Amino acid sequence: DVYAQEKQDFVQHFSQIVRVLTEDEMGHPEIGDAIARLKEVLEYNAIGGKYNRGLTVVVAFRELVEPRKQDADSLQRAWTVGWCVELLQAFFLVADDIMDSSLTRRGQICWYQKPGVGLDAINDANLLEACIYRLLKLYCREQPYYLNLIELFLQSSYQTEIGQTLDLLTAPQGNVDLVRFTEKRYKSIVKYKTAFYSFYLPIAAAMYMAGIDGEKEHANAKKILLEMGEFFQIQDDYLDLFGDPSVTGKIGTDIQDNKCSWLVVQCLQRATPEQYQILKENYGQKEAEKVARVKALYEELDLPAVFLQYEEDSYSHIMALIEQYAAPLPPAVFLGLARKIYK
Amino acid sequence: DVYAQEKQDFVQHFSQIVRVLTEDEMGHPEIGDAIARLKEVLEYNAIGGKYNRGLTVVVAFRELVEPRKQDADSLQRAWTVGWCVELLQAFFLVADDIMDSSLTRRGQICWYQKPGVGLDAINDANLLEACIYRLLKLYCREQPYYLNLIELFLQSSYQTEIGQTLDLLTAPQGNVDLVRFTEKRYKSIVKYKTAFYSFYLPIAAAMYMAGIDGEKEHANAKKILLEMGEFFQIQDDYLDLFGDPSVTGKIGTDIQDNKCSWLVVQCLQRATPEQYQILKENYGQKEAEKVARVKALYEELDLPAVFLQYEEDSYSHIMALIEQYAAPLPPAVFLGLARKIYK
Ligand SMILES: O=P(O)(O)C(Nc1cc(-c2ccc(OC3CC3)cc2)ccn1)P(=O)(O)O
Ligand SMILES: O=P(O)(O)C(Nc1cc(-c2ccc(OC3CC3)cc2)ccn1)P(=O)(O)O
Ligand SMILES: [Mg+2]
Ligand SMILES: [Mg+2]
Ligand SMILES: [Mg+2]
Ligand SMILES: [Mg+2]
Ligand SMILES: [Mg+2]
Ligand SMILES: [Mg+2]
C-alpha cells in the first residue's frame, strides 16, 4: 500500500512545517504569543487524522514526476504542498464543527468546545488557512507552478464555501426541511463542499507540480475525481449514523442538525406516507428519542444494505471512469486513491 | 475633499461588482441558491460604511498613475481593487462581531444576530474573502502587478489575523486581565490587527498598480501608514465608549469584552491603588452598572481630555513623518488620508 509507504516521512515532515511557520517570525518577538497560539492550533487540529488528502499529493507526485527529477528539494516541496492540503482541511473542520454544533473530532473534543477557546476558534481556523499561502511562498515562490498552486487553493476554497452555503441553506434549523432533500440537490452539495477539495485539489496540485497544466488533462482527471468525491461524501453521511465513533473519531449530528444527508434522501425515496410523517415529526431535532426514531426508520427501510449495494455499484462506475479518462496519467494514481476509500 | 469627489462613482461601481460575482456562475445553475445567499451577504455587509479604505485605493491610484495612463479599463481595475479592500474589511467585521458579541454595526443589527443567520455567518464571512481573489482574477490576471496584489492581500490577512490572535489572547473572558494591558502590548496589537490592512494595504495596492514596487518605497510608505493606523485604532477605542452610536453606527463592547483598549491602558497609567481596585472589580463584565462604573472612572481621570491631547500630538507626529518619508510620492496621497481621519 503506497500510502503507508509514504506516511511516516510525511508525518515527520510536520515538525519542519511547524518549525518554519514558527521561525519565520523570530525577527518579530512582539508577536511571540500569537505564534505560540498558532502552534497550539496546528498541533491540536492538523494532527490525528488519516492524512489521506495530503498524502495523495505526495503519492501522486512520485507517480507523475520522473524519478531523476525527484531531488531532495522537490520532495520537500511535495510534502509541503501535501501539508497545505491538510491545513486547508484543518481550517474547514474547525469552522464546520462550530457550525454543526459537533462534540468530538479525531478522537477528542472539538477545538471550539475546549474551555477557553469557544468562538475564538473562528480566528484560529482562518490562521490555519493563512498558513497555506505562507508555506506556498516560502517553499514554491521560485517555481513555474507557483501561481497555478495559489490559484488552485483559492478556487478550491471558494468552491468548498459555495458547497457549505448550500449545505447550510438546505438545512435551516428548526424548520421541516424534507421537501428540500432531493437527489439533485444532494449531488450539487457534495460536489462543491467535498469533491473539489478532497479529490481534485490534491491530484491537481501534484499535476501542476509535475508541469502537467493542460486544461484537457485537468478536465479528464476531474471527471474521475469529482465522482470519487461524491461517493466519499455518501460514505461520510452513512458513517455519521452507522459508523463506529471509535473508528470515525467523531459523533454524528446530521439528523439533529437537519442535514440533506444521503441517508435522508434515500429514506424519502422509499418511505410510505406514514413513514414520511414519522420522519417529519422526528428529523432535525435535538431530542435523543427522536433521533433514535429516525435511525430505526432507516433500519426498517434497510438503508445499510442499500448503502452497501451503492458502494459496490459506485466502485464499478469509478473504475470504468478510470478506464475511460485516466490516460495519459498512470492509472495507479487513481487506483491507489480508490483502494483507500473503498473497503 | 478628493474622497467625496471619487465617492459616487466608487459606490455605483458596487452593482457591477455584485453583477460580475453573481454572473460569473450563470453557467452553473445548481449553485443559484448559494449565489443568491452571497448576494444577500454582500448587500447587508459590504454597504453602509464610509468606504474610506476602498476609496483610498482609488484616490491614491489617481495621484500615482500619470493621467494619460488612466484609461477606462484601468480605472475599473482601480475601483475593483478598492472594493476588494472593502470586501476584506467585510469579512473581518462579520467574524469580529461574532467574536466580540456585538449588537449593531453600520446602523443595523449585526449579520450573525439576524434571525436565521447565527453561526452560518462564519461561512458567509469567508465567502466575502473568497470574492476578493475572484475579482483580482477576473479584472487583473493579465496585469504585471497581479501576483503582487494577490500576495499583498494574503499577507495583509495573515498579519491582521495575527493581530486578532493577540487581541483575543490579551482579553480572556472571565479573567482579571489588567496586568496584561501595557502600552507595549497595545501598540503590537493595533499594528497587526488594524494598521496593516487599514492604511498600508490600500496605498500599497495603488502603488503596485502604478508600477511602484520597490522595497524602499514600500518601507517608507509603511513608516507613515502604520503610525496613522495606530492613531486610527486609538480613536476607535475612544469612540467605543465615548462616541455617538448614532454616528459610529455601533454599540461598544470593549469594557464588557475585557479588551486591551487604549482607554484601559491610559487608565492603568493614572489610577491610584484604590482606582486600580475599582477597575479590577468592574472591568470585563456584562453587568451595566459595572460598565458604568468603569466609564465614570475614566471620566474622573479626564481620559477624554487625554485623548484630545493625544490626537493633536499624533497628528503633528504623523505630519512630521510625511515630511520625512513621503518623497518621491506626492505628499497629497498621505495628506488626504490624514485629513479623513483627524477631526
Ligand atoms: O467531517 P464532517 O462529517 O463534519 C463533514 N465536514 C465537512 C466540512 C466542510 C466545510 C465546512 C465549513 C466550511 O466553511 C468555510 C469557512 C469555513 C468549509 C468546509 C466541507 C466538507 N465536509 P460534514 O459536511 O458532514 O459537516
Ligand atoms: O469595528 P470594531 O470596533 O468592532 C474593531 N473591529 C476590528 C476587527 C478586526 C478583525 C477581527 C477578526 C478577524 O478575524 C479573521 C478571521 C476573521 C480579523 C480582523 C480587525 C480590526 N478591527 P475592534 O478591533 O475594536 O473589534
Ligand atoms: Mg460537520
Ligand atoms: Mg457540516
Ligand atoms: Mg459528515
Ligand atoms: Mg469588534
Ligand atoms: Mg474585536
Ligand atoms: Mg473597536
| Cell representation of residue B265 | 491602558
Burial of B334 (0-12, 13-18, 19+ CB in 10 A): buried
Catalytic position from the list A97, A177, A237, A257: A237
Please tell me what DSSP assigns to residue B180: G
Catalytic position from the list A193, A222, A293, A340: A193
Binding site membership of B123 for ligand 1 (Cβ less than 6 Å): yes
What DSSP element (H or E) covers B240?
Answer: helix B215-242
Query: Is residue B259 annotated as involved in ligand binding?
Result: yes
Tell me if B184 and A30 make a contact (CB, 8 A cut-off): yes
Q: What share of chain B is helix, strand, coil (3-state, %, to 5)?
A: 75, 0, 25
Q: Which residues of B touch A188 (CB under 8 A)?
A: 30-31
**Scanning the structure block, which residue is given the C-alpha cell 477528542?**
A108
Ligand 6 centre from B287 Cα, in Å?
Answer: 19
**Angle, alpha carbons A54-A57-A63 (nearest 5°):** 145
Task: Report chain B residues touching chain A, CB-CB < 8 A.
Answer: 30-31, 33-35, 37-38, 95, 98-99, 116, 118-120, 122-124, 126-127, 130, 133-134, 137, 147, 150-151, 154, 157-158, 161-166, 168-169, 172-173, 184, 188, 191-192
Rounded Cα distance, B256 and A32, in Å: 26
Helices (runs of H) and strands (runs of E) counted in chain B: 15, 2
Catalytic position from the list B10, B14, B91, B231: B91
User: How large is the angle between the packed helices A201-209 and A52-64, nearest 10 degrees?
Assistant: 30
CATH code (residue A286): 1.10.600.10
Rounded Cα distance, B89 and B160, in Å: 10
The count of structural domains within chain A is 1
Residue A167 φ/ψ, nearest 5 degrees: -50, -50
Nearest to A34 among B99, B166, B173 (CB): B166
Rounded Cα distance, B23 and B183, in Å: 49
Active site residue B167: yes
How far is it between the farthest Cα atoms of chain A?
68
Going B147 to B149 to B154 to B159, the CA torsion angle's sign is: positive
Q: Is the peptide bond before A328 cis (omega within 30 degrees of 0)?
A: yes
**Angle, alpha carbons B156-B158-B161 (nearest 5°):** 110
What would the DSSP string read from start to end of B63-128? HHS-GGG--HHHHHHHHHHHHHHHHHHHHHHHHHHHHTT--EETTEE-GGGSTTTGGGHHHHHHHH
| Cell representation of residue A211 | 508541469
Residue B244 φ/ψ, nearest 5 degrees: -90, 115
Burial of A27 (0-12, 13-18, 19+ CB in 10 A): exposed
User: Do the strands A108-109 and A104-105 form a parallel or antiparallel pair, or are they unpaired?
Assistant: antiparallel
Active site residue A96: yes
Q: Which residues of B touch A165 (CB under 8 A)?
A: 33-34, 37-38, 123-124, 127
Query: Is residue A89 annotated as involved in ligand binding?
Result: yes
Find all residues with CB under 8 Å of A248, minimum gap 6, and list them: A239
Nearest CA-CA partner of B82 in B166, B22, B139: B139
Please tell me what DSSP assigns to residue B171: S
Rounded Cα distance, B339 and B308, in Å: 16
Nearest to B123 among A35, A134, A168 (CB): A168
| Cell representation of residue A85 | 492540503
Rounded Cα distance, A132 and A156, in Å: 12
What DSSP element (H or E) covers B39?
Answer: helix B32-45
Q: What is residue B285's three-state secondary structure?
A: coil
Q: What is residue B237's three-state secondary structure?
A: helix
Cα dihedral A312/A317/A319/A325 (nearest 10): -170
Query: Is residue B37 annotated as involved in ligand binding?
Result: no
Tell me if A166 and B34 make a contact (CB, 8 A cut-off): yes
| Cell representation of residue B10 | 466608487
Rounded Cα distance, A236 and A67, in Å: 36
- Report residues whose beta carbon is within 6 angstroms of any ligand 2 atom: A 122-123, 126; B 92, 95-96, 100, 160-161, 164, 193-194, 236, 240
Ligand 4 centre from A99 Cα, in Å?
Answer: 7
Ligand 1 atom closest to A99 (CA): 12
What residue's CA is closest to ligand 2, atom 18?
Answer: B92
To what resolution in angstroms was this structure determined? 2.2
3-state secondary structure chain A: CHHHHHHHHHHHHHHHHHHHHHHCCCCCHHHHHHHHHHHHHHHHHCCCCCCHHHHHHHHHHHHHCCHHHCCHHHHHHHHHHHHHHHHHHHHHHHHHHHHCCCCEECCEECHHHCCCCHHHHHHHHHHHHHHHHHHHHHHHCCCCCHHHHHHHHHHHHHHHHHHHHHHHHCCCCCCCCHHHCCHHHHHHHHHHHHHHHHHHHHHHHHHHHCCCCCHHHHHHHHHHHHHHHHHHHHHHHHHHHHCCHHHHCCCCCCCCCCCCCHHHHHHHHHCCHHHHHHHHHHCCCCCHHHHHHHHHHHHHCCHHHHHHHHHHHHHHHHHHHHHHHCCCCCHHHHHHHHHHHCC
Judge whether B213 and B207 are in contact, CB under 8 Å: yes
Rounded Cα distance, B115 and B111, in Å: 9
Tell me if B168 and A120 make a contact (CB, 8 A cut-off): yes
| Cell representation of residue B143 | 496585469
Chain A nearest CA to B119, separation (Å): 6
User: Which one-letter amino acid corresponds to residue B321?
Assistant: L
Binding site membership of A236 for ligand 1 (Cβ less than 6 Å): yes
**Scanning the structure block, which residue is given the C-alpha cell 496540485?**
A205
| Cell representation of residue B166 | 493577540
What would the DSSP string read from start to end of B241-262? HHS-HHHHSS---TTTTT---H
The residues pairing with B109 across neighbouring beta strands, listed in sequence order, are: B104
Rounded Cα distance, A254 and A251, in Å: 10
Rounded Cα distance, A158 and A176, in Å: 29
Q: Provide the residue range defining the domain that includes A188.
A: 1-343
Judge whether B110 and B97 are in contact, CB under 8 Å: yes
